Amino acid sequence: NITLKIIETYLGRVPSVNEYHMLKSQARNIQKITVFNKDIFVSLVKKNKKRFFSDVNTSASEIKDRILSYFSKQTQTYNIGKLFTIIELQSVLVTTYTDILGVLTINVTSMEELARDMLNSMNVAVVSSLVKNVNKLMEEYLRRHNKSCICYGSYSLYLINPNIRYGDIDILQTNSRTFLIDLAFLIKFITGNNIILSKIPYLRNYMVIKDENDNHIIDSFNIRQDTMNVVPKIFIDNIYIVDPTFQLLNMIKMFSQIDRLEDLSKDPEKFNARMATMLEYVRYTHGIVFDGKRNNMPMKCIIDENNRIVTVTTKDYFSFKKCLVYLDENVLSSDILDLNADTSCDFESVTNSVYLIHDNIMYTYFSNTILLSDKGKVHEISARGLCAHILLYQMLTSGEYKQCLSDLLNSMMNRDKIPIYSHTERDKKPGRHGFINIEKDIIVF
Amino acid sequence: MDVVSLDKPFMYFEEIDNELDYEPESKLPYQGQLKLLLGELFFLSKLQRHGILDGATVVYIGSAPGTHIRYLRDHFYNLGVIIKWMLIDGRHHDPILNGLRDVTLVTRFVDEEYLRSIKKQLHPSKIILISDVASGNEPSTADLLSNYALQNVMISILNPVASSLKWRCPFPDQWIKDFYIPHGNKMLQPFAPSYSAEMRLLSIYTGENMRLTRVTKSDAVNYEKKMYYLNKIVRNKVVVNFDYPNQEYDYFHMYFMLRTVYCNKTFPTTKAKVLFLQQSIFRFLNIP
RNA sequence: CUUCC
RNA sequence: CCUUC
Ligand SMILES: Nc1ncnc2c1ncn2[C@@H]1O[C@H](COP(=O)(O)OP(=O)(O)OP(=O)(O)O)C[C@H]1O
Ligand SMILES: [Ca+2]
Ligand SMILES: [Ca+2]
């Protein structure tokens, strides 16, 4: 029947006694893949080649094969697994390449002072050029795909201060899973390079397409459409950026990561730019009260070290007095469950946690290590991130924050480069490193 | 007539606030695979709302036929989520599960060596355990135990991060010995046997700190009593305030479960989302 | 396991 | 075969 037909028209041969039963399932997937014009594709990667990859060592008849060459392995692949594997990927091209990729081809300096200043208060511490081409694609992307891809990180600030030295166009997108598969092929084709796409068990919803030699091409974070909305999004240049305010809160939350302080005692200027480009945004946007004078900041944080859980007194700001900042996600989760709460607000890889307010109290998990100024003494640069974190929530929920943030900022203006006594050992996140080998035909998560 | 106004269904067992003496005198189609579709859509949904479910491997032991499971699979796939689905069961699985690259189908039965194997195999991917192990008419406490005994082993072995374990206290009058089951919230199941005391033991793990709760017959009485109350008095009530097409307690209950489920597609009110899910769900098993 | 915006 | 349903 019409079924066996499709399997041979696809297998470029007769299906074995078994092969039938297996693929039998992959109906239209396999059928569609076939009665799908390859040519048009062959020319679309071409039409792209010259635009973001004009500078490549490839030819029209050379590339053309690759494309076909791939849609031709059904006939040589005899491993039901590898077979199933190449079919799921051929299908990604088939339905999304057009929609997701093909479409493509159709004042501040002021705070430079404060930047250095707030930065200093702290300071107490101790990649293949395809990067380029891609960084050229991504630009158009954010433009085309406003609502299915939002950006941040280094890049973004350069869109508010073209005087910002960035390296990676960082993003959050509702389809990252596809987005990378596609691009993967894009590069795998035009380049002729055998890339790899991996998921890093550590980061939540994270897949970075690296290079044939581990040359970080570009990484991405996936987020529910749900979350995609609540994110403080901003418009400028027909692309959405993560509202710089928010982006500055993580800024603060980042620096509670010792690791990143052994990074501060390095590029004191690197951050010195992104920094003020932010202090500048808000100050101008929400007229941030910038006078060293600032009360009720860095709420008294109490780190029970036996439970590996902090205790912040947001009181002077939000209905809830305490905010139990957990340091063992897997714990918070169970206890949360114990709280019989099943509607905790999760904002995926954004806040890197799920905030909860059972009985007028806030429970949360801090994705970083905690800084100590002394034994049991929570170094201040901690109450820095600790706060922000909360605020992030406040922001993804739209609540009385402006006040606190402005307040928080002022507390950063010129301060003791306080010694760092110790720091917490961030909970290990489990999971095997999964990857996709377009080339070796291996899919694993 | 036999109605009621509630604030929320009894989600977990610790929440039933009354008892009733079990009296042995003791409603859909394809409802079996439904009771499950929810408890599972629910369990994993949380694991996702808390992250755990991220790129992890769900090891479903006691799955088959497991028709529903497909649904679940399609749900999360459609959600961008990444998960390997390992279904092990001596009996076979609803063919609608073959050909799935994201699903492995073991046609074997579990024991000591076996877990030690798959564990080694799967490691270090984080594991999510879903046991629905069985053993006609209704399992004798003799079996109930051996099963639970076995479930407590999977746990210790596959050392999972979270687990949804079958859990129905062994009838008092038929009690044998005590035992421990892992700590964890116990969710009541919607569209479940008129008078069942089954409930999934949802439990998330600490790491090097496993926890079990000693089970006693006194404990067992509480169940029959409380549970029976639920099945006879609670479920058979009508939530007159609940603004939903169907108003039976269960539909009300089923609501509160889905309310927490995730779904990208944009939706107006929640009733909007839930309702759709429900629809789509019943759709799948094919129930009017 | 290491592999971490 | 220039964005494949
Ligand atoms: N601990 C954290 N938790 C959640 N998000 C974080 C954390 N630390 C940093 N981030 C986010 O990562 C974003 C950018 O990563 P990063 O590369 O380190 O700085 P950048 O501005 O992108 O400069 P470059 O990308 O190195 O050129 C900025 C911040 O919102
Ligand atoms: Ca970055
Ligand atoms: Ca990055």
Nucleotides on chain C that have an atom closer than 7 A to a protein CB are 1-5
Sheet containing A442-444, strands listed edge to edge, beginning at the edge strand earlier in sequence: A233-235, A240-242, A150-152, A170-173, A218-222, A206-210, A196-199, A434-437, A442-444
Within 7 Å: CB of A170 and strand C?
yes
Residue whose C-alpha is closest to residue A328's, from B185, B123, B183, B208: B208
Q: What phi, psi does A376 have (nearest 5°)?
A: 85, -10
H-state helical runs in A218-340? 225-230, 244-254, 258-261, 270-285, 329-338
Give the burial string for A289-306 (b: 16+ CB within 10 Å, else e).
ebeeebeebbbebebeee
Report the distance separating Cα B43 and Cα B46, nearest Å: 6
By CA distance, what is B44's nearest residue in A? A342
Question: For residue A363, which of A307, A431, A402 has the smallest C-alpha distance?
Answer: A307
CB neighbourhood size of A18 (10 A): 9
**Top-level class of domain B1-288:** alpha beta
A349 touches strand C (CB under 7 A): yes
d(CA A173, CA A176) in angstroms, rounded, equals 5
The count of other CB atoms within 10 Å of the CB of residue A248 is: 22
- Please confirm whether the linkage preceding B29 is cis (ω < 30° from 0): no
Q: Which residue has the tokens 């459609």?
A: B78
DSSP SS3 for B163: strand
How many angstroms separate the CA atoms of B234 and A182, rounded? 52
Whole-Å CA distances, A441 to A80, A81, A207, B121? 11, 9, 17, 20
Angle at B104 between CA B148 and CA A177, to 5 degrees: 115
Contact at CB, A434 and B203, closer than 8 angstroms: no
Interface mutation target, options B50, B127, B185, chain A, most CBs of A under 10 Å: B50
Q: Is B166 a catalytic residue?
A: yes
Chain A residues whose CB is inside 8 A of the B51 CB are 204, 329, 333, 346, 354
Q: How far apart are alpha carbons A351 and B24 in whole angstroms?
A: 52
Fold of the A127-244+431-445 domain: Beta Polymerase; domain 2 (3.30.460)
Rg (CA), chain A: 25
- One of B35, B46, B166, B226 is an active-site residue; which one? B166
- Under DSSP, the state recorded for B170 is P
Task: Estimate to the nearest angstrom the gap between the alpha carbon of A75 and the chain centroid.
Answer: 38
CA-CA distances (angstroms) from residue B240 to B231, B249, B252, B253? 18, 10, 10, 13
10 Å Cβ neighbour count for B277?
23
Q: Does domain A1-106 have CATH number 1.20.1270.320?
A: yes
User: Touching check for B85 and chain A: CB below 8 Å?
Assistant: no
> What separation in Å is there between the alpha carbon of A157 and the centre of ligand 3?
14
A226: CB partners within 8 A, 6+ apart: B262, B264
Q: Which helix (H) or strand (E) holds A55?
A: none
DSSP state of B164: E
Tokens of B234: 């609670």
**Structure obtained using:** X-ray
Show which residues of A are catalytic.
168, 170
Radius of gyration of chain B (CA): 19
Q: Say how many CB pairs under 8 Å bridge A and B.
A: 111
C1' of nucleotide C2: residue with nearest CA = A433
Closest CA to B277 of B28, B77, B71, B96: B71
CB of A342 within 8 Å of a chain B CB? The answer is yes
Helices (H), A175-224: 176-190
Question: What is the resolution in angstroms?
Answer: 3.2
Mutation to probe ligand 1, out of A250, A262, A393 (largest number of atoms < 8 A from CB)? A250
Segment holding A353, helix H or strand E: none
b/e per residue, B235-250, with b = 16+ CB within 10 A? bebbbeebeeeebbbb
| Alpha carbon distance A325, A366 (integer Å) | 6
The pairing of strands A312-313 and A322-326 is antiparallel
Task: Locate A221 and state its tokens.
Answer: 């974070």
Tokens read off for A378 = 């929570």
Contact A224, A174 (CB under 8 A): yes
B219 touches chain A (CB under 8 A): no
> Does residue B150 come out as left (phi exceeding 0), alpha (psi in the -120 to 50 range) or beta?
alpha
Question: What is the Cα–Cα distance from A21 to A8, expressed in whole angstroms?
Answer: 13
The helix/strand/coil state of B234 is: helix
Q: List the single residue in B122, B161, B264 with the smallest CB-CB distance to A224.
A: B264
Q: Is residue A197 within a helix (H) or strand (E), and if so which, with residue range?
A: strand A196-199
Q: Given the structure tokens 């100050």, which residue do they identify?
A: A283
Q: Measured between CB atoms, does B8 come within 8 Å of chain A? A: no
- State the DSSP H helix or E strand holding residue A216, giving kind and residue range, or none if neither: none
With CA atoms as reference, the chain B residue closest to A83 would be: B101
Structure tokens at A307: 């439970």
CA dihedral sign of residues B248, B254, B258, B260: positive
What is the CB-side half-sphere exposure of residue B55 using CA atoms within 13 A? 24
Extended beta strands in A80-188, E state: 150-152, 170-173
Which among A222, A224, A354 has CB closest to B262?
A: A224
Q: Where are the domains of chain A?
A: 1-106, 107-126+245-430, 127-244+431-445
Q: Which residues pair with A423 in a beta bridge?
A: A371
Q: In Å, what is the CA distance from B254 to each residue of A83, B34, B51, B81, B160?
A: 40, 10, 23, 23, 27
B265 chain-A contacts, CB cut-off 8 A = 225
Task: Tell me how many helices (H) and strands (E) chain A has.
Answer: 18, 16
Cα–Cα distance list, B28 to B32, B94, B191, B276, B282 (Å): 9, 20, 8, 19, 11
Task: Say if residues B189 and B155 touch (Cβ distance below 8 Å).
Answer: no
Question: Which of A169, A56, A180 lies closest to A48 in space, CA to CA?
Answer: A56
**In terms of Cα–Cα distance, which of B88, B89, B77 is closest to B53?**
B77
Take residue B184 and report the two structure tokens written for it: 């964890």
> Judging by beta carbons within 10 Å of its beta carbon (0-12, 13-18, 19+), is residue A388 exposed, middle or buried?
buried
Residue B268 makes CB contacts below 8 A (sequence gap 6+) with none
Is A91 in contact with A30 (CB distance < 8 Å)?
A: no
- Residue A318 CA to residue A330 CA, distance in Å, equals 26
C-beta separation of B167 from B201 below 8 A = yes
Identity at B190, one-letter amino acid code: P
Atom 8 in ligand 1: which residue has the minimum CA distance? A254
Q: How far is A240 from chain B (nearest CA, A)?
A: 19
